[PDB]
Design a protein around this nucleic acid. Structure first.
Lengths: 177, 94, 69, 116
RNA sequence: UCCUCCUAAAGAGUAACGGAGGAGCACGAAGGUUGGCUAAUCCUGGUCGGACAUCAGGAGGUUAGUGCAAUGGCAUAAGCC
RNA sequence: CAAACUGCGAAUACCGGAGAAUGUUAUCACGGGAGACACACGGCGGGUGCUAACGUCCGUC
RNA sequence: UGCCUGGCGGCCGUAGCGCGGUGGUCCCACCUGACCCCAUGCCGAACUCAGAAGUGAAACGCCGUAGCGCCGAUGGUAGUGUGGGGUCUCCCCAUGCGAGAGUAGGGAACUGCCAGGCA
């Protein structure tokens, strides 16, 4: 709500001005945010998965659901039904506050900040990349760190093209490529 | 500019086709438009001589049947698998 | 042993209640009106009347219908 | 798509009722408006129908779509069915979830003097 | 001993010391009822990723799965909660 | 190109309802009396065999 | 009732797929909180409690496009029952039934009931 009001005040207006849209809701609208952890090392130890799920629940406003295996392959030695990871389906005030807290402090202070990529898209304007070094987030303190771990960050939007994603990045001011 | 001779058809069937082939003839049909399609019987040697020309692929055929001139075009032609004989031809009233 | 297969009763044939129409290994026909399907994928008549064959559905599947005389 | 999923969900009961060959009552639910009708066994005839959009039954309702409106529509449908002589129709809630306005209208129809 | 595909020639049945195979199982759930969901395969991004752990999106529409070897069928699912 | 291949698709065969016609009811059921229970050759559609057949076995006449 | 919209059936690629246009009069969809009706393998995920704050956009109805794709003749061809013949591995004679595919053509489908609105 706190960031949603400012979003509707300025981002919607600037996107409409730059894209000369006619429909009131032609501006892209955020659907949800997904925070998944596809480490793949859950086979060796199961406690790390629980610790990471607890950390995700603490940093977010909800407890992530566990995801089971999709397809078994003999090369990687993976069975069926064995839990591997979990994801957080951020929606509503929780997603708004989490995104605000991220974009406020967490994004600028990252080692080797080369800038986000504006071309890497799924194909319909959904930005689904991955970020390593989970220590960058403020909630993960040195008390609860276990190992250098990575995460996958995905933002879901009603948009169906990469131009809308570029417009959203421009609204987010897109520091550098 | 091309002369074509045609004969009326009064028989129908595989037996009729066999009779025509034995008598050194073969049938043909014309179809297209609102008019009902009709079958026309033609000889073998004269029709083969007519088809021997290289301009048949892009020429309008003037069928003379029952004292009437009809302009048609042969889109599809049926030929014997290996023997150099013709058993059936198709025409459209273009 | 050679398991019996085929259509016991075709269309337009009068049948009685409890009479099987076709005993099929799988499901090549589907029960319609007054037709029941057994546990062995066998269609049996649930009334008295004639049998009819019809094809319908998105996959053009066949159905068995019974009309009372 | 939501409408296609709802239709496919209701298709199970719709096909199951075909073998019975008995008249059924169905209700279409939407927050904007609610529709109701009683389908004949043939599946192409309706003995009676109503719509919340119509003021003839929406005149006493604060709006077309609400729990009280659904209850009133169900009561009216049940009364019209009883006066027409539906002869113990069945129930089919268009593949909905039986927890809200559909439950209220079903309860109203049952208390109106029905036995389904 | 039982069962599955041709032979067996568009009803059914139909044989040779003909051509080819699986079994002596199993359940107090792997059954029933009600409410819900819907595959193998590829691509996009991805410390770990070697193309082949899993993830978000797109195509695919049952070649997946449907316990045994096989056959007929199963999307309304007989597949899963 | 195909026997454990059909997005198509014959002839022919078989079932059931109605029907003029014919075959000494030629049809079916009941009870008694039976005979055989080692068929060969040819025609039609196939298998086995090496798409060597006039070798072999099937259903029908 | 002339037109538009939604539901209740058949028809199951003439109803399907690609592209463009149009739609808020009515209907439908987009919405936040959900501690309340309902509930989550987390999530209001689906459904549900207020309806227009506005819109017709993601989706959805309609029209055009015969582009992809589909149905599909007459005839012909392959084949086959009946009797015979030939140079009997197969073919032909008289007759009946008759393929597939392809061509012509078809078509952006149609039909019954209910409800609202535009007259």
């Amino acid at each position: 709500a706190k960031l949603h009001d400012y979003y509707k005040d300025e981002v919607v207006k600037k996107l409409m001005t730059e894209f000369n849209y006619n429909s009131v809701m032609q501006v892209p609208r955020v659907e949800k945010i997904t925070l998944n952890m596809g480490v793949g090392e859950a086979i060796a130890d199961k406690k790390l998965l629980d610790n990471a799920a607890a950390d995700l629940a603490a940093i977010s406003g909800q407890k992530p659901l566990i995801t089971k295996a999709r397809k078994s392959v003999a090369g990687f030695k993976i069975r069926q039904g064995y839990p591997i990871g979990c994801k957080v389906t951020l929606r509503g005030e929780r997603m708004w506050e989490f995104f605000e807290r991220l974009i406020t402090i967490a994004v600028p202070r990252i080692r080797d900040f080369r800038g986000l990529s504006a071309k890497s898209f799924d194909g319909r304007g959904n930005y689904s990349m991955g970020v390593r070094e989970q220590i960058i987030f403020p909630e993960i303190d040195y008390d609860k760190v276990d190992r250098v771990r990575g995460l996958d960050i995905t933002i879901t939007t009603t948009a169906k093209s990469d131009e809308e994603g570029r417009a959203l990045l421009a609204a987010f001011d897109f520091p550098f490529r | 500019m091309f002369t074509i001779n045609a004969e009326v058809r009064k028989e129908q069937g595989k037996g009729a086709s066999r009779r025509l082939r034995a008598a050194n003839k073969f049938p043909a049909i014309i179809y297209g438009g609102k008019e009902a399609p009709l079958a026309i019987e033609l000889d073998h040697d004269k029709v083969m001589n007519m088809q021997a020309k290289a301009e048949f692929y892009s020429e309008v055929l003037t069928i003379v049947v029952d004292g009437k001139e009809i302009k048609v075009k042969a889109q599809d032609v049926q030929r014997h698998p290996y023997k150099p004989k013709l058993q059936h031809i198709d025409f459209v009233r273009a | 042993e050679a398991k019996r297969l085929g259509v016991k009763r075709f269309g337009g044939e009068s049948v009685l209640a409890g009479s099987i129409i076709v005993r099929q290994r799988g499901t090549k026909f589907h029960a319609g009106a007054n037709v029941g399907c057994g546990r062995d994928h066998t269609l049996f008549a649930k009334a008295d009347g004639k049998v009819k064959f019809e094809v319908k559905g998105p996959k053009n599947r066949k159905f068995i219908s019974i009309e009372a005389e | 798509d939501k409408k296609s999923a709802r239709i496919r969900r209701a298709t199970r009961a719709r096909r199951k009722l075909q073998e019975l060959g008995a008249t059924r009552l169905v209700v279409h639910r939407t927050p904007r408006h609610i529709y109701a009708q009683v389908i004949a066994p043939n599946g192409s005839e309706v003995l009676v129908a109503a719509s919340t959009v119509e003021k003839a039954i929406a005149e006493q309702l604060k709006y077309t779509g609400n729990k009280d409106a659904a209850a009133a529509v169900g009561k009216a449908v049940a009364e019209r069915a009883l006066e027409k002589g539906i002869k113990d129709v069945s129930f089919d809630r268009s593949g909905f979830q039986y927890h809200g306005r559909v439950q209220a209208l079903a309860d109203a129809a049952r208390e109106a003097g029905l036995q389904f």
